[PDB]
Symmetry: C4
Subunit: 31 residues, 4 copies
């Protein structure tokens, strides 16, 4: 139930961390 939502949320945040590093990379590649 709730464990299951959380667990998704833990995944989703992890995609969100990856998405930041990527943005961080692109800024560097830019200036």
């Amino acid at each position: 139930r709730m464990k299951q939502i959380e667990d998704k949320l833990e995944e989703i945040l992890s995609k969100l961390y990856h998405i930041e590093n990527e943005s961080a990379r692109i800024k560097k590649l830019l200036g």
Copy 2:
């Protein structure tokens, strides 16, 4: 209900994979130009 949640979380999820992809593309763009 708890199943509308589940669908939306899967949808959040695909949208995440989609955006990793669009940004990877650009990173890769710039990574030659």
Copy 3:
């Protein structure tokens, strides 16, 4: 309870839509 999670999820996806348009913009600005 659950209404409340959903409602957050509905918001979070909406930030995720905005984040795409932005990426879409940047690609355009790039090539």
Copy 4:
């Protein structure tokens, strides 16, 4: 519990605002160069 959820959702949330910001910055970058 249902409160670990709430914290993480707020954290997902700030991370969203953070990334809108980092991408807006770049859009704005490129928007002159």
